[PDB]
Coordinates of C-alpha atoms in Angstrom, one line a residue:
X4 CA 114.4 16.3 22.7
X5 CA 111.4 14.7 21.2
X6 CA 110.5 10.6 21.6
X7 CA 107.4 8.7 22.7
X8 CA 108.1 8.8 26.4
X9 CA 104.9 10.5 28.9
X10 CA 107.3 13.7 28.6
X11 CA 108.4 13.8 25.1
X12 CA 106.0 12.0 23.3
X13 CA 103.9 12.8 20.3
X14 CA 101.3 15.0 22.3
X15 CA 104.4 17.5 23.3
X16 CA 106.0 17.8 19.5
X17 CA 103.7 20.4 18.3
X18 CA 106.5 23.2 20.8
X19 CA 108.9 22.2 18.8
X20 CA 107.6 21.5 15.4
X21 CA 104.5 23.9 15.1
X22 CA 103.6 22.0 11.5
X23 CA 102.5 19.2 14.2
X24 CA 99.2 20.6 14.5
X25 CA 99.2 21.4 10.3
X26 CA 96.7 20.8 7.7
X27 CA 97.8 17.2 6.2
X28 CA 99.5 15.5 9.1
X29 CA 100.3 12.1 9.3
X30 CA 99.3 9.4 10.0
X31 CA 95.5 8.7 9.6
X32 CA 92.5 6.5 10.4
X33 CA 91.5 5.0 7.3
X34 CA 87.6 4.9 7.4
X35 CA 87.5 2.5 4.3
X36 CA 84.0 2.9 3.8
X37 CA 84.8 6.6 3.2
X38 CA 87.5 6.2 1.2
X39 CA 86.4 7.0 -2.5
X40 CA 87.1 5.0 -5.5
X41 CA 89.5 6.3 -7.9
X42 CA 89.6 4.9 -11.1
X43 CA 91.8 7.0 -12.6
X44 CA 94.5 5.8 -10.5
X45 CA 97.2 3.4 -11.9
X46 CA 98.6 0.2 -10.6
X47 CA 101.4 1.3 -8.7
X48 CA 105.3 0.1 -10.2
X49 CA 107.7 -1.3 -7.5
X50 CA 111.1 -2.1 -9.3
X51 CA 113.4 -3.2 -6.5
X52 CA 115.1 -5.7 -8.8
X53 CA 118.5 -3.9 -8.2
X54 CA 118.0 -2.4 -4.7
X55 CA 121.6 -1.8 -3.2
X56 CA 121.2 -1.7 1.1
X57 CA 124.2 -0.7 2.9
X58 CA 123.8 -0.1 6.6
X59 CA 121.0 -0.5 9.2
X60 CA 121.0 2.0 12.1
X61 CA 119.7 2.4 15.3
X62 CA 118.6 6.3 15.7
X63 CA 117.3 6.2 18.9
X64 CA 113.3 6.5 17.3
X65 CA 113.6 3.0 15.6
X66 CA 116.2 1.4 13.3
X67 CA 116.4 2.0 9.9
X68 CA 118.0 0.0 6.9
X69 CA 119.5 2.4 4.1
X70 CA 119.9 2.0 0.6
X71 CA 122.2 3.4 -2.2
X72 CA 120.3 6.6 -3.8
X73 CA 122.7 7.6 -5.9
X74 CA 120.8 5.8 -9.1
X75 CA 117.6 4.5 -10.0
X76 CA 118.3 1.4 -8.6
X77 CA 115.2 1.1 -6.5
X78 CA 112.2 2.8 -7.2
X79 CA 108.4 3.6 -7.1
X80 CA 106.6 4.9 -9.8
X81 CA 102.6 4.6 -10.9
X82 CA 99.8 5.0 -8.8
X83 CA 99.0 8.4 -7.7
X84 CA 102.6 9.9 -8.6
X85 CA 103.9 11.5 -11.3
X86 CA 107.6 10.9 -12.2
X87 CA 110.2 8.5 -10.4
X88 CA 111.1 8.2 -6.9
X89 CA 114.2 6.4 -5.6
X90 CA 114.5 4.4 -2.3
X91 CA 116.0 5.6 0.5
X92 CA 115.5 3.8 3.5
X93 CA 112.9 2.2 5.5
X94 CA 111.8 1.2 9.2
X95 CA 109.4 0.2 11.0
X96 CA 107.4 1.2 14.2
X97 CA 105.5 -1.1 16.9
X98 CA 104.1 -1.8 19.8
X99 CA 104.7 -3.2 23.2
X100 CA 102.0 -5.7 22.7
X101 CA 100.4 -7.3 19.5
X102 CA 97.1 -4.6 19.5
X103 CA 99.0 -1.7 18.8
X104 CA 102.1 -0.6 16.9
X105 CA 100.5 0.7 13.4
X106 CA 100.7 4.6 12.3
X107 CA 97.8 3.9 10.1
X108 CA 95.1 2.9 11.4
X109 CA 92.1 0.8 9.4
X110 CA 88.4 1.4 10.7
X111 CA 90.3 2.0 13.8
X112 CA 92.0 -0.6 13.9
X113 CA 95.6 -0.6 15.4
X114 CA 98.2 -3.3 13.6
X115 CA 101.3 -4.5 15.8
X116 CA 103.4 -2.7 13.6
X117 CA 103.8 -0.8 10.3
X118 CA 106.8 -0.8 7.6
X119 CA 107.7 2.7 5.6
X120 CA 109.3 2.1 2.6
X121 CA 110.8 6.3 1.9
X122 CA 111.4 6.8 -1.8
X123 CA 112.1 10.7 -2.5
X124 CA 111.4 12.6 -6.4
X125 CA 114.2 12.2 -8.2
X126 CA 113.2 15.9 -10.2
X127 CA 114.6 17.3 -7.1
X128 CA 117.9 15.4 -6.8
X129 CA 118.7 14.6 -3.2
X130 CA 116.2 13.7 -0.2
X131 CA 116.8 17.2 2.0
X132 CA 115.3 19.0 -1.2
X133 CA 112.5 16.9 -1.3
X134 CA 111.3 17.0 1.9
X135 CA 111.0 21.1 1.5
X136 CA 108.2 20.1 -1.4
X137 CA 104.9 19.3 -1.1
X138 CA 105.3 16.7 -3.4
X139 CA 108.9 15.8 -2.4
X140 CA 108.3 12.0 -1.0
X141 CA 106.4 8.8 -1.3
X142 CA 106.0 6.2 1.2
X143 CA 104.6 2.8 0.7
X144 CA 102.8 1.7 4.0
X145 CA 102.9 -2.1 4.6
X146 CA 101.0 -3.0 7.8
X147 CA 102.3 -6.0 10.0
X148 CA 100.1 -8.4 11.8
X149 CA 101.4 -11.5 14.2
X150 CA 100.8 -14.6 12.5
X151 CA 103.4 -16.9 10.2
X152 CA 107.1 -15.5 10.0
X153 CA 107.9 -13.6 7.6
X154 CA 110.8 -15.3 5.8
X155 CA 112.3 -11.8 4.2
X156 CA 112.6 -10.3 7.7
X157 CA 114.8 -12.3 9.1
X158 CA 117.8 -11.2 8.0
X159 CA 116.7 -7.6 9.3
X160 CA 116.2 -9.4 13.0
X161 CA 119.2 -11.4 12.8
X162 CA 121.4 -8.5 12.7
X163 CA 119.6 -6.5 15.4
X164 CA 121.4 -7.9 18.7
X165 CA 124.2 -5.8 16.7
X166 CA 122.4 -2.4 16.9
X167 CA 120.7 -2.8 20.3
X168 CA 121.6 0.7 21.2
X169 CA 121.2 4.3 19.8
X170 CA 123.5 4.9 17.5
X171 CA 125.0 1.6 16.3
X172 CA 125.6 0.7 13.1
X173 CA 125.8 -2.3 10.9
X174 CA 126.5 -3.4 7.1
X175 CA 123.3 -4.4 5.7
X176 CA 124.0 -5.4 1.9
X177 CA 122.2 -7.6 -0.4
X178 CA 119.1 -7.0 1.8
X179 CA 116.0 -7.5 -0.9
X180 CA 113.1 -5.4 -0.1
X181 CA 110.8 -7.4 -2.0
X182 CA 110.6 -9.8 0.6
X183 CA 108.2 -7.7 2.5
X184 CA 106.0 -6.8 -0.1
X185 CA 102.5 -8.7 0.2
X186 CA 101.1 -10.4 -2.7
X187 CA 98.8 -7.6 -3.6
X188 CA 99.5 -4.0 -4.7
X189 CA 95.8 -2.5 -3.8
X190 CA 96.3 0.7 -1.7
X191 CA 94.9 3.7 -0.5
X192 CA 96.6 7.1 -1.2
X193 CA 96.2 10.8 0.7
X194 CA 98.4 13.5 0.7
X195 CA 100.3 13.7 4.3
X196 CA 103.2 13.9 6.1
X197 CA 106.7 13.0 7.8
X198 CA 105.5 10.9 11.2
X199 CA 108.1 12.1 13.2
X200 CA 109.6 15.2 13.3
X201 CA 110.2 17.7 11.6
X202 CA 106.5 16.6 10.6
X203 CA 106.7 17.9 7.1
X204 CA 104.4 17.8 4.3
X205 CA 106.1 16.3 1.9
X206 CA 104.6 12.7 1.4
X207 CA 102.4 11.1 -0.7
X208 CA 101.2 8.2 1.3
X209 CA 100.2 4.7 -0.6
X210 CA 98.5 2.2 2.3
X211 CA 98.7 -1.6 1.3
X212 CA 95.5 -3.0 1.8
X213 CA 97.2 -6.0 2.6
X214 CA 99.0 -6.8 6.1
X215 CA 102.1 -8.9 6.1
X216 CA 102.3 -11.5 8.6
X217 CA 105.3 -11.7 10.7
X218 CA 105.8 -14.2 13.6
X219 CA 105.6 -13.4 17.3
X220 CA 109.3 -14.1 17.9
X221 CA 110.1 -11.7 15.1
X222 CA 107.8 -8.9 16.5
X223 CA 109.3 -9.9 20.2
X224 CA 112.8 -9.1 18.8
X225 CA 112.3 -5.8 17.5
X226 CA 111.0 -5.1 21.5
X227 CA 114.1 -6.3 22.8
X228 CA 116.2 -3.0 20.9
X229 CA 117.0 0.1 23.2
X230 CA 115.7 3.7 22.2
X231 CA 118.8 4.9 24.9
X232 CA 122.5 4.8 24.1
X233 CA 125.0 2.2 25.4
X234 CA 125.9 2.6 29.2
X235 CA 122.6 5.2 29.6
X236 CA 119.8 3.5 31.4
X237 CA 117.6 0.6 29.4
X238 CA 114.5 1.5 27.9
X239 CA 113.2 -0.4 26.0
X240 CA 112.0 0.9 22.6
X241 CA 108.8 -0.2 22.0
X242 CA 105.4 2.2 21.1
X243 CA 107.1 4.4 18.8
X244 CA 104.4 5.0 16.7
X245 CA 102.7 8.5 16.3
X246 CA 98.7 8.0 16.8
X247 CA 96.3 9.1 13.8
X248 CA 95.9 12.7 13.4
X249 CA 93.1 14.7 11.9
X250 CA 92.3 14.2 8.4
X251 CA 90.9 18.0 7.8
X252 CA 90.1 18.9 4.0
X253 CA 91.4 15.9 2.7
X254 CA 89.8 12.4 1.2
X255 CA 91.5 9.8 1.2
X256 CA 91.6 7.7 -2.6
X257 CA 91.3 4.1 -3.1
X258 CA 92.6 2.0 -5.8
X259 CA 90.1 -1.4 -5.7
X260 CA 86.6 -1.3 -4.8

């Protein structure tokens, strides 16, 4: 099955999800020079005031932490979208070493590692239907670089020594999700996809601008989980990122100048 190994890695998904090689795949470089201006766009609306996480999971890719859906307890609104989307989950995905890890990718330039925040439109009432829709997701894209900690992750690395393996589990409440938000909202926006399989194009991507800084021994920590399962052999997991794709017919929108 699919991973970022030399024989199941990104270049190898396209037999099994043909969309792989589609006409809004994700992710992108983001030439920001390119990029046009769009001052019609609104300020986006994050309202994670009464997120509800439950679990974190290892699933063998990356780890992700979940949240309750069930409600509009956590959601993103504004910006490029029309209507309400609620929060689902998020994860990350990084590299081996500080130069790489990012999805996204800035005037080619490769972060160690990149946060998606997966919020799904709430006019289509669970996440499965909104994947089928071209318009079905939104994902806020928060870029990581090595620098200061970042105080609001470390719960999230605390608890990963309990999920070293594919397909542990742990309770993961009263996680806040704001605490990995950077000060500014500026983004850029395209129309793209799911950047792992089954690939669809279903998102509405929103790029911060603005990295968040994270420290090496919180970075090193997320190197140190396992993409195998308990009692198979260790690898770690490490590069699971999906490297940028073409942009075709598509122009990527700013929201600053």
């Amino acid at each position: 099955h699919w991973g970022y190994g030399k024989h199941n890695g990104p270049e190898h998904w396209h037999k099994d999800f043909p969309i792989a090689k589609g006409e809004r795949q994700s992710p992108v470089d983001i030439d920001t020079h390119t990029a046009k201006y769009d001052p019609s766009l609104k300020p986006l609306s994050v309202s994670y005031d009464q997120a509800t996480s439950l679990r974190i999971l290892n699933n063998g890719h990356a780890f992700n932490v979940e949240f309750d859906d069930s409600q509009d307890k956590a959601v993103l609104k504004g910006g490029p979208l029309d209507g309400t989307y609620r929060l689902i989950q998020f994860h990350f995905h990084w590299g081996s070493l500080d130069g790489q890890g990012s999805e996204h990718t800035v005037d080619k330039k490769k972060y160690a590692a990149e946060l998606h925040l997966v919020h799904w439109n709430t006019k289509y009432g669970d996440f499965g239907k909104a994947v089928q829709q071209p318009d079905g997701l939104a994902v806020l894209g928060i870029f990581l670089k090595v620098g200061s900690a970042k105080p609001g992750l470390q719960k999230v690395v605390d608890v990963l020594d309990s999920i070293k393996t594919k397909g542990k589990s742990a309770d993961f409440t009263n996680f806040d999700p704001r605490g990995l938000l950077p000060e500014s909202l500026d983004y850029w926006t395209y129309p793209g996809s799911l950047t792992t399989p089954p690939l669809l194009e279903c998102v509405t991507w929103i790029v911060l601008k603005e990295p968040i800084s994270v420290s090496s021994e919180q970075v090193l920590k997320f190197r140190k989980l396992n993409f195998n399962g308990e009692g198979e052999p260790e690898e770690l997991m490490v590069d699971n990122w999906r490297p940028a794709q073409p942009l075709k017919n598509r122009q990527i929108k700013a929201s600053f100048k």
